[PDB]
Amino acid sequence: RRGALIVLEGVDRAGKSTQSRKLVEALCAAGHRAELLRFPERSTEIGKLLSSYLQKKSDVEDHSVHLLFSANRWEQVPLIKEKLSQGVTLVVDRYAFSGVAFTGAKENFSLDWCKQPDVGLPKPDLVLFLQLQLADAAKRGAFGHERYENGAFQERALRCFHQLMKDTTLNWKMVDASKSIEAVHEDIRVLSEDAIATATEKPLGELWK
Amino acid sequence: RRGALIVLEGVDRAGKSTQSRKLVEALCAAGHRAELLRFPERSTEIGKLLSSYLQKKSDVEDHSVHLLFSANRWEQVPLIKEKLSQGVTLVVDRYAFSGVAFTGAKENFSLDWCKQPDVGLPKPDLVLFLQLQLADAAKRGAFGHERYENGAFQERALRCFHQLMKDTTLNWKMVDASKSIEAVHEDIRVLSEDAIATATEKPLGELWK
Numbered sequence: 300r301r302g303a304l305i306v307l308e309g310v311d312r313a314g315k316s317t318q319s320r321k322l323v324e325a326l327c328a329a330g331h332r333a334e335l336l337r338f339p340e341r342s343t344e345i346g347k348l349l350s351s352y353l354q355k356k357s358d359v360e361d362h363s364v365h366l367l368f369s370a371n372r373w374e375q376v377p378l379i380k381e382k383l384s385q386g387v388t389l390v391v392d393r394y395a396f397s398g399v400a401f402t403g404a405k406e407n408f409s410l411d412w413c414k415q416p417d418v419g420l421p422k423p424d425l426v427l428f429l430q431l432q433l434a435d436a437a438k439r440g441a442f443g444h445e446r447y448e449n450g451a452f453q454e455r456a457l458r459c460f461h462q463l464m465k466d467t468t469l470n471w472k473m474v475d476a477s478k479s480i481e482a483v484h485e486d487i488r489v490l491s492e493d494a495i496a497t498a499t500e501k502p503l504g505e506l507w508k
Numbered sequence: 509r510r511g512a513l514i515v516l517e518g519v520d521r522a523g524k525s526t527q528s529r530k531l532v533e534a535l536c537a538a539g540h541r542a543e544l545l546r547f548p549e550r551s552t553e554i555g556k557l558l559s560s561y562l563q564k565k566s567d568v569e570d571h572s573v574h575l576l577f578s579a580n581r582w583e584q585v586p587l588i589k590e591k592l593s594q595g596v597t598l599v600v601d602r603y604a605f606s607g608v609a610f611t612g613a614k615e616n617f618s619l620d621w622c623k624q625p626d627v628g629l630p631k632p633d634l635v636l637f638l639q640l641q642l643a644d645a646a647k648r649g650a651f652g653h654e655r656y657e658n659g660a661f662q663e664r665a666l667r668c669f670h671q672l673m674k675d676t677t678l679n680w681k682m683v684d685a686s687k688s689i690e691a692v693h694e695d696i697r698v699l700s701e702d703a704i705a706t707a708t709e710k711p712l713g714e715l716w717k
């Protein structure tokens with residue numbers, strides 16, 4: 300009985316990382332075999348290149364960096380498939396959608412070009428999108444010092460995310476991330492249990508194909 | 509007056525590297541500003557990952573390695589555009605065509621997926637394809653120890669190259685690489701001078717778009 304592939308995407312400071320950690324914890328506490336993944340996965344060779352870029356310690360040509368972000372997902376695909384086939388549900392903090400939305404926020408990057416490298420990746424069974432109004436995100440401290448951490452760029456990324464959500468091949472669920480950490484968590488947890496229960500029914504799909 | 513972008517592609521041991529070096533030398537000797545490039549460009553961070561893979565010192569997931577080969581071209585695009593805009597002709601030993609042909613020789617890699625990462629790269633003004641019958645390539649010593657250096661895989665790559673050559677958006681020229689080094693060189697040199705003279709007329713194109 301395979302595991303589910305659940306991705307969390309969402310606006311700046313909406314709580315992707317907090318909710319992904321809490322979700323894995325709660326699923327395991329409820330008897331599921333679930334494990335957390337995140338992209339970028341900064342531990343691999345490619346992941347280090349990406350981390351340096353995001354910290355502004357290095358500059359990387361925009362197309363090159365886009366392909367490295369995708370390659371960083373592909374190198375984890377054998378693991379993702381193995382775990383899911385072993386019945387382990389994977390909760391993933393960001394995935395190909397952030398890949399497309401952030402590069403697509405740059406000038407002269409079509410959504411189509413941005414999607415292609417990720418075509419064929421394991422298709423998520425559930426894509427949660429954590430929505431939060433900017434006034435509310437602002438109360439969540441201040442921007443970080445990493446690349447892309449500024450309102451105007453975030454806004455362009457958000458427009459890209461909205462285009463991706465028009466894709467009905469994907470099980471997108473909107474989450475109101477303005478509530479408390481615990482309230483948001485319960486919303487996510489229940490959506491997740493439902494997905495886990497239905498994923499054991501159809502084979503793992505391929506993204507964007 | 510911009511430089512031309514000339515790529516050399518071709519079968520195993522057909523003489524891509526020998527002819528690219530000789531071409532640059534001859535162009536410079538004839539008053540052109542020309543410089544040699546090669547892919548993979550093994551000197552960069554990404555290039556080292558690729559070199560390790562090709563030497564079989566490391567294993568890389570097939571999709572990841574494909575995207576690294578493309579990223580290795582993109583990271584050189586600012587240089588390529590700068591040089592061409594300065595009037596420097598660039599002679600390139602392998603390019604996106606080898607990228608597509610070698611990954612596309614693997615099982616379950618469509619030509620379409622393989623092309624996408626490279627869509628938008630500087631379009632070559634001239635693509636030379638060095639053709640050589642296997643009996644003739646065999647007289648050119650023995651296979652190397654690197655990955656992909658075996659007859660069956662080379663044959664599949666060759667079929668992919670033939671599909672790419674159906675693309676009329678590109679100025680493909682076939683070269684009979686069975687002749688002597690000097691004879692092949694003269695054929696290439698003359699094709700190249702012609703291209704250099706016409707490239708100063710239309711802007712640099714974008715590949716596969």
Ligand SMILES: Nc1ncnc2c1ncn2[C@@H]1O[C@H](COP(=O)(O)OP(=O)(O)NP(=O)(O)O)[C@@H](O)[C@H]1O
Pocket residue numbers: 309310311312313314315316317318439476477478479480481483
């Ligand atoms: N529902 C919430 N209410 C209030 N604060 C929250 C909530 N969720 C997260 N936070 C806090 O806001 C900050 C951002 O949380 P985090 O889960 O790291 O966001 P994120 O969505 O991963 N942001 P980023 O990865 O930078 O886009 C952290 O200090 C969290 O404790």
Ligand SMILES: Nc1ncnc2c1ncn2[C@@H]1O[C@H](COP(=O)(O)OP(=O)(O)NP(=O)(O)O)[C@@H](O)[C@H]1O
Pocket residue numbers: 518519520521522523524525526527648685686687688689690692
């Ligand atoms: N026309 C030719 N006649 C005879 N030997 C040749 C010719 N061209 C190249 N060679 C030799 O064959 C070997 C392969 O040449 P080289 O130019 O390195 O090929 P290549 O096309 O780059 N092969 P590879 O990069 O391995 O696909 C070298 O020893 C060359 O000296």
Ligand SMILES: Cc1cn([C@H]2C[C@H](N=[N+]=[N-])[C@@H](COP(=O)(O)O)O2)c(=O)[nH]c1=O
Pocket residue numbers: 338339353368369393394395397398399401402446447448
């Ligand atoms: C997974 C992924 C993330 N990103 C971005 C989103 C984030 N930048 N911001 N803001 C950054 C990762 O931030 P975190 O490491 O905090 O998740 O990289 C890409 O640009 N492409 C990708 O493929």
Ligand SMILES: Cc1cn([C@H]2C[C@H](N=[N+]=[N-])[C@@H](COP(=O)(O)O)O2)c(=O)[nH]c1=O
Pocket residue numbers: 547548562577578602603604606607608610611655656657
């Ligand atoms: C440029 C490029 C080369 N290649 C291959 C062709 C070659 N393998 N063989 N045989 C190898 C480079 O060989 P040379 O370094 O000798 O040119 O990488 C790819 O697989 N993808 C690419 O994008």
Ligand SMILES: [Mg+2]
Pocket residue numbers: 315316317
């Ligand atoms: Mg986070």
Ligand SMILES: [Mg+2]
Pocket residue numbers: none
């Ligand atoms: Mg397409």
Ligand SMILES: [Mg+2]
Pocket residue numbers: 524525526
């Ligand atoms: Mg060579």
